[PDB]
From a paper:
During HIV-1 or HIV-2 infection, the capsid is a necessary component that protects the viral genome and recruits host factors while trafficking to the nucleus. The capsid is comprised of approximately ~1,600 copies of CA molecules, which oligomerize into ~250 hexamers and 12 pentamers (capsomeres) to form the distinct fullerene cone. In this study, we leveraged the approach of templating the HIV CA lattice assembly on liposomes, together with stabilization by the small-molecule host factor inositol hexakisphosphate (IP6),75–79 to produce regular HIV-2 CA lattices. We report the first high-resolution structures of HIV-2 CA capsomeres in their native mature lattice using single-particle cryo-EM.
With reproducible assemblies of HIV-2 CA amenable to a structural study, we sought to resolve the binding of FG peptides derived from Nup153 and CPSF6 to identify differences in interactions compared to the HIV-1 capsid. Binding of the Nup153 peptide (residues 1411–1425/1464–1475)26 was detected by co-sedimentation assays pelleting the liposome-templated CA assembly. Following cryo-EM analysis, high-resolution structures of the HIV-2 CA hexamer (2.98 Å resolution) and pentamer (2.99 Å resolution) in the presence of the Nup153 peptide and the hexamer (3.16 Å resolution) and pentamer (2.82 Å resolution) in the presence of the CPSF6 peptide (residues 313–327)86 were determined. Nup153 FG-peptide density was readily observed in the FG pockets of HIV-2 CA hexamers but not pentamers. The density was strongest inside the FG pocket and extended to contact the CTD of the adjacent CA chain. An atomic model of 8 residues of the Nup153 peptide could be confidently built. Consistent with the high conservation of FG pocket residues between HIV-1 and −2, the model of the Nup153 peptide in HIV-2 aligned closely with the known structure of the Nup153 peptide in the HIV-1 CA hexamer65 (~0.5 Å RMSD). In HIV-1 CA, the K70R mutation has been shown to lower the affinity of interaction with FG-pocket binding factors, including Nup153,19 but the well-conserved R70 residue of HIV-2 CA does not appear to affect binding. Similarly, residues along the adjacent CA NTD present more polar character near the HIV-2 CA FG pocket, which may have otherwise been expected to interact poorly with the first Phe of the Nup153 FxFG peptide. In addition, the induced assembly of apparent HIV-2 CA nanotubes with the introduction of the Nup153 peptide was observed.
Residue numbers in the entry:
A (entry chain B), E (entry chain B), G (entry chain B), J (entry chain B), K (entry chain B), L (entry chain B): 2 to 9
B (entry chain A), C (entry chain A), D (entry chain A), F (entry chain A), H (entry chain A), I (entry chain A): 1 to 221
Write the structure that this text describes.
């Protein structure tokens, strides 16, 4: 997915 | 964050390189010390959820606690969905009644978060609400990480009274015990866990000694 | 970046000496840590592609990863060219329908990037689009550089549970596994790779123990 | 803090990341040194009670003294309630006659603290009043923490006169003795606690020697 | 309660 | 640099104490590292030649390279004189058609450099042109100072592949080889100068392996 | 060429 | 300090966290070095007495010298009272003819200090006058603390001439000898206290050798 | 320095705490290195003589060189008095034709220095003129302090050519030899003072070898 | 009194 | 005199 | 001459 645990 | 422009309009200004960084450091140097919660609130006062997220994200360690915060954020958001009535669909001209994915800062953009925040009909503090949910997750982490417990914070034979006390009151904050129970611990557990010689000095004072009285009395004992 | 002036016009303001530098450091000190991606986005919020390039350029090391980013940027740009129809030629008065060399920030100037960005007809976020392509290259690098793998992140006999967990969740982010597979690893691989004594403590809890529950339960085990 | 906007309106601007932090450090590095009180006042000049609280809160240590400050704040607030007449209830249009929970910064919001502060009828310095109550708690702490006492600050055989004096005048400030008693100590206890050879040098000068006279005379003695 | 000794 | 004022006028604002200094440091700490060229451009974006000179001047070391830059600046300036037609003399009211001593920043003042820059007839980027001539001198210096050569950058038996690669791509930039020759070196010299075991891993992949492919494949070899 | 991997 | 607002009004802006602190450091690191006086004046240019006080107060050490400054401030204030005629009482509408307790910054507020400063009738520089009185107290302290005396500053056999001179001219400033006597010391005591070999080099030059001449001549002697 | 206000008026803004300090450091860390002169000019661009003085004053060491600067400032000022005609006395309404005590920054105030600077009749750059006189005194000091001489800067047997050259060109600047003589030294003394093996490499090149040519040729010799 | 040697 | 070598 | 390699 992403390296953004919080947000989009 | 948000700034205003000629005509009464609002825009997304960015968060700063010295605040993201200071939050990263307060979280690391203090290791989710109780103070992390107001250090976060102050660094994020006037902010929007998008930046509150980016700040928390930039932190690259203590990622076990950042997940506890994320589980707490999803729980508070599920309650906002549960309590709110999700009214009849609104036109494209109007913006979606803010939902929990939107305030938590995921599904929504930054321009829709500001719009609601400065919406004439009902300015909604999406930034403050998401931040509050976090203080809960951060507070749980302070407690999860608390090195000791107030009951086990006891004066050491050569440890001074004030140092023992500093630890006791700090733990009282982090353990976040109910305020009525905090008054009992301060007036009882502290005469109880203190060295006997210093304990007798406080007992010699009488009943309900104030801290100024106790801290002064056991100075040099 | 961009700032506005009397009359509704826009201009190129420069990027700052404290942001280029903080990006250089976030990339080096953290060595393309997962956090480099939001550290970059925040430092570049309100920026144009010209500066996003200069920031990435100033970095003088980890030039193997900066090339991986450059290969990813050229690939995303070739898709924008492939999907867009390159319509009939427009007059000199009008600016070229932005192309991939232009957004990637090479063929175009900075005044044409801003023009499109604040173009009344179709304001285009050339700055945000190029930055997104980069987060992909940076994310690939985080993963390429990840020191370990989540499957091999296992509690050491004297290592504590929380430290083992911090590594596990950090790797889950950097490896960027699909979210559904992240739920399986967190609820299974973590009871599996943990010491047996602590593993039994989590097993004693029951099924689907929350992290707050597991982190509290194996405290002191 | 507070800033003004077009139309004569006022708003809550936030406190800054460099002031909260400098206060935290002044309180820690100096360990509630006497200077903490003006270091606090200056860092909080133009502030509102909400931020004065957040600053004091961010401090995560010396939590025994922060409680002494909190007991002093609740006492000064109980006097404001005791002296004020709590007049007949006012309409919703009007804001509550400020009370002690409100100025101390707890029960009230930040927008009601500013409102009163810039209220045309009676602008009230809620920020300054709460800050003053704190200088009292901080001053009590300086004294509670004072390492020595002015009576026991005495010139050591090889210690120089000026160093002995620096300690004596510093303690005179922190002990916060009455000004008339400060004149007696400076003119008597200082010839008294000084080495005999240097004491005779001051005595050789005559009566009521000024400090410039005494500090110059015992230079090299 | 909270980790806010002062305020709300 | 330059700032604008009421009435549409322009003025010389000064360069800042944090930019002159950061340039001095980028030139020294990095020792004319390739990154010095964009570090310079960014620190000088919106500047005039007068300050571009003062920045370069403040540097007090590596004065051999600052002379190479000065010889390159005088050469580019002699070409501007050679190509431009030095038209018929203009009146005092009009400013001298800018010449090379003027753009290089010597013969001319700062108010005439700005005048040309914001001259309605032909705004001339005297600041950008002189800065470009410098990037050439700085680039020559990067190469003159380059510690090694890409052909001699070879994987050491215990050196890892990525570190060998970081050096190879960094040198490719600094040596500033033509882009077509850069593609040949990356796809040939890098399988060639690498350890044999790692070289066979890249060979096992096949032909034209991408860097992500090669960097992943020789991980742990 | 140049020491600018990204851009012109 | 003071800032102006729409309508021609003036207000009290606060002093800054970086100036109070830099003054504290200049006073401590330099230990009331002669430079403390202009370091203070510059840090306080545009300030009001209230802040000049807070700066001096924040300093928590060298409290013997801060008292010498306070005795000097009370003396200069008693002269302002002695020379001024304390005219007939003025109405409440008008502000009290400024007195010495008021300028010294004690009896008066900050809004009355600014009022006088920007009073149309007679703008009074209460900030500059109090600051001048302090430069006198600070200057006395520089001298009281001066480690040596110019007469005893003599070239050591292996000490170089320039170092001996640096000390001599520095002491000449701090001792604050009259300018006519400074010319005698520079032209006589400096040939006199210097090593004999270097003294003969200066004597070989002739009479009234300039410092450039003397410093160049004894270079390597 | 100076700032402008509504109505076309000018005022004295103060110099900053980061510029006085950076000048102090450039003068000390570099010990009047040649770069001190442009470091000073840039830090003082837009300044008035009053602050140029305060900056130079705050420096508390190298007071032998600060006196050389003061002797040079008094000499340049005596020439301005000697060349100017001191015309017939002007009315009080008009300000004194600026004299040398006034520009040097002593006899005059700061409001009269600004007045002349923005005087409609003849705006006079009192700030720039005094600053230029100083660059002369500072330049003399650079040379007085220069550790070596260009003639004695010679390549050491194991010292590399570039390092020997860096010293040679640096000294050429500080010694401030005439430009025609600088061309002779660079093309002759540098083949002459270099090691013989490296000297032969430069000789093998031919006549008038450029520095890029010489620096490249003796690389590794 | 106070920890304010100067002022009120 | 003063500790101001330059100025008044 | 001067300690200004670049400029006037
Ligand atoms: O412009 P920035 O990149 O932010 O950097 C700083 C910072 O500015 P901000 O106030 O906008 O953050 C300083 O202010 P603080 O952070 O301390 O509040 C400010 O100086 P002050 O501290 O005096 O406000 C200084 O500009 P200046 O010194 O001209 O006021 C300014 O720009 P620089 O980085 O260029 O100094
Ligand atoms: O050398 P710099 O790169 O300029 O950085 C430091 C740093 O601040 P910045 O990184 O924001 O510039 C210091 O603060 P920290 O980052 O360590 O917290 C700061 O000092 P403080 O710690 O007191 O804030 C100091 O500047 P200053 O002492 O003026 O505040 C400043 O360097 P400079 O001293 O060269 O400006």
């Amino acid at each position: 997915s992403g390296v953004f645990t919080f947000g989009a | 964050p948000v700034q205003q422009t000629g005509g009464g309009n609002y825009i997304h200004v960015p968060l700063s390189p010295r605040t993201l960084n200071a939050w990263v450091k307060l979280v690391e140097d203090k290791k989710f010390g109780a103070e992390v919660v107001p250090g976060f609130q102050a660094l994020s006062e006037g902010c929007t959820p998008y930046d509150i997220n980016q700040m928390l994200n930039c932190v690259g360690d203590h990622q076990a606690a950042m997940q506890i915060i994320r589980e707490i954020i999803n729980d508070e958001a599920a309650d906002w969905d549960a309590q709110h009535p999700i009214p009849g669909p609104l036109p494209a001209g109007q913006l979606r009644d803010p939902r929990g994915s939107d305030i938590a800062g995921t599904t929504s953009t930054v321009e829709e978060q500001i719009q609601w925040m400065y919406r004439p009909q009902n300015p909604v503090p999406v930034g403050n609400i998401y931040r509050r949910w976090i203080q809960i997750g951060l507070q749980k982490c302070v407690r999860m990480y608390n090195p000791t417990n107030i009951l086990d914070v006891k004066q050491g034979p050569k440890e001074p009274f004030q140092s023992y006390v500093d630890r006791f009151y700090k733990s009282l904050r982090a353990e976040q015990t109910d305020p009525a129970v905090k008054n009992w611990m301060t007036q009882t557990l502290l005469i109880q866990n203190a060295n006997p010689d210093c304990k007798l000095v406080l007992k010699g004072l009488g009943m309900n000694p104030t801290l100024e009285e106790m801290l002064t009395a056991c100075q040099g004992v």
